[PDB]
Specification:
Blueprint lengths: L2 E6 L16 H7 L4 E3 L5 E3 L2 E6 L5 E6 L13 H12 L10 H4 E6 L4 E6 L6 H5 L13 E2 L2 E6 L8 E7 L3 E6 L12 E6 L3 H9 L5 E4 L6 H7 L6 E4 L4 E7 L9 H10 L2 H8 L5 E2 L22 H10 L12 E2 L2 E2 L1 E7 L3 H15 L4 E7 L1 H10 L4 E5 L8 H5 L7 H5 L6 H12 L4 H17 L3 E7 L2 E4 L24
Parallel strand pairs: 1-12, 19-20, 19-21
Antiparallel strand pairs: 2-3, 4-5, 5-7, 6-7, 8-9, 10-11, 11-12, 13-23, 14-23, 15-21, 15-22, 16-22, 17-18
Helix pairs in contact: 7-9, 14-15
Subcellular location: Periplasm
Organism: Escherichia coli (strain K12)
GO molecular function, one term: peptide transmembrane transporter activity
Length: 498
């Protein structure tokens, strides 16, 4: 009644707060906590830090910490424990290159038990928002470091947060219980069991049978026709949030024939996205015309959508010299067929379904898309090294969008750098992304985001497909299930059946 059972496609991992896979971000966020806490309005509030000051040049910050917080094993949280966490994270600095605060922090020291001083290389504006992320700047008890580090593993995953990992059984389940000595608000739920169920259909079956009480996740959570059925079944409860991030193709500007602007612009008019969403996504998601929805901070720019218009796509191709050989449906230019490889995770039925639609729509304008569905490791390798024509991709949701997603475009081992590498203006874009991150002149910050997002739109680097939502299927007794401000978090401590 105050215990729930839910599911996740894999175990939560070791819950090292400072590492990535196989740790699951939402589980790191249940056990470990930040200095400051992200809010839906884009601000942060005091959290383990009660307050803070900064220097006039914006580079030196001093946080006053709570003095009443203990880790779940009774050891105190104080500035020394925080400073040792920052050292453990930055001892592995290379791994966090995607996150610009990890390159900005030049020193962290405890000035006393309650005062923590962080010095930055520059006046990095997103500092507090990156400190609020699920990882890596959250705090494990230093006693649980292994030989004074975390990058080589941890002992027990001891955090300050409202949940404690009770036990994990690999390939089976993970069980958390409420922290009875939490410094903040006491959750209503006392125990949460996660059953490991990798297949979406099997998840839906688990819920119908009553084996689980709650499913919570993005558009991959369960089959969408099933979800629509469940939303009409008065024995169940369902929800669909307002959109949290964009799903899009990345087009390789450095690889033929996507290296041609006119080919990328044509592809951007070839897909009927509303039909795609109604055919493959059961009508449950929203059409996307831009990298970021106009509701994302800094991104209400009046960018012009490319509406589905196969006549215009064909015209653009014809004008660029891609015309149809006698008796053939696939265009050719300089003897080369207009062929494009579309990469995605082959096991993933929803991705395959979308890819088949996109392939069919692009065949109608004379582009031959070849589907390359591979296991996830091979797709991630392709993202990193630029071995793709088109690849499925997504943004990151709040509080990463847009700043941190844009920051990462500079990192060479990410899909977006690779996709953009054929642009003559790539250096300028990357210089402008560095400038926007440290700008405190609000007019210049808006102007730099407008320039970067407008160049990316006008160069047709992406094919935005949908703004996707979180969705929930639950037993009615759990009541209304809230959403967290951070798109990757699950706010279990806010569920309040009574």
């Amino acid at each position: 009644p105050d215990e729930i059972t839910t599911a996740w496609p894999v175990n939560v991992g070791p819950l090292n707060p400072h590492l990535y896979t196989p740790n699951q971000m939402f589980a790191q966020s249940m056990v470990y906590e930040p200095l400051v806490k992200y809010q839906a309005d884009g601000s942060v509030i005091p959290w383990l830090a009660k307050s803070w000051t900064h220097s006039e040049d914006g580079k030196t910050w001093t946080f006053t910490l709570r003095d009443d917080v203990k880790f779940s094993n009774g050891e105190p949280f104080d500035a020394e424990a925080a400073a040792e966490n920052f050292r453990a994270v930055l001892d592995n600095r290379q791994r966090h290159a995607w996150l610009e605060l990890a390159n900005q922090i030049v020193d962290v020291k405890a000035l006393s038990k309650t005062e923590l001083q962080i010095t930055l290389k520059s006046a990095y504006y997103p500092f507090l928002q990156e400190l609020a992320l699920p990882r890596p700047f959250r705090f494990i008890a230093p006693s649980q470091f292994k030989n004074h580090e975390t990058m080589n593993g941890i002992k027990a995953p001891i955090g300050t947060g409202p949940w404690i990992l009770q036990e994990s059984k690999l390939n089976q389940y993970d069980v958390f219980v409420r922290n009875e000595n939490y410094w903040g608000e006491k959750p209503a739920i006392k125990k949460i069991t996660f059953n490991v169920i990798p297949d979406p259909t099997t998840r839906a079956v688990a819920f119908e049978t009553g084996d689980i009480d709650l499913l919570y996740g993005n558009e991959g959570l369960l089959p969408l026709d099933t979800f629509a059925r469940f939303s009409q079944n008065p024995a169940y409860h369902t929800q669909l949030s307002q959109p949290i991030e964009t799903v899009m193709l990345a087009l390789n500007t450095a690889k033929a024939p996507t290296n041609e602007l006119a080919v990328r612009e044509a592809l951007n008019y070839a897909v009927n996205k509303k039909s795609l969403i109604d055919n493959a996504l059961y009508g449950t998601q929203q059409v996307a015309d831009t990298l970021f929805a106009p509701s994302v901070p800094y991104a209400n720019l009046g960018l012009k959508p490319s509406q589905y218009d196969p006549q215009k796509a064909k015209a653009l191709l014809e004008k660029a010299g891609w015309t149809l050989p006698a008796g053939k449906d696939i265009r050719e230019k300089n003897g080369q067929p207009l062929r494009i490889e579309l990469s995605f995770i082959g096991t993933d039925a929803l991705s395959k379904s979308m890819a088949e639609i996109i392939q069919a729509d692009m065949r109608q304008i004379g582009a031959d898309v070849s589907l390359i569905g591979e296991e996830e490791s091979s797709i991630y390798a392709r993202q990193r090294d630029g071995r793709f024509g088109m690849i499925f991709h997504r943004t990151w949701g709040a509080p990463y969008d847009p700043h941190a997603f844009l920051s990462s475009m500079r990192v060479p081992s990410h899909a977006d750098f690779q996709a953009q590498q054929g642009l003559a203006d790539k250096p300028l874009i990357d210089k402008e992304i560095g400038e926007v991150l440290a700008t405190h002149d609000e007019t210049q910050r808006q102007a730099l985001y407008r320039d970067i997002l407008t160049r990316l739109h006008d160069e047709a680097v992406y094919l935005p497909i949908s703004y996707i939502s979180m969705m929930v299927v639950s037993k009615p007794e759990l009541g209304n299930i809230p959403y967290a401000p951070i798109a990757t978090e699950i706010p279990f401590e806010q569920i309040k059946p009574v």
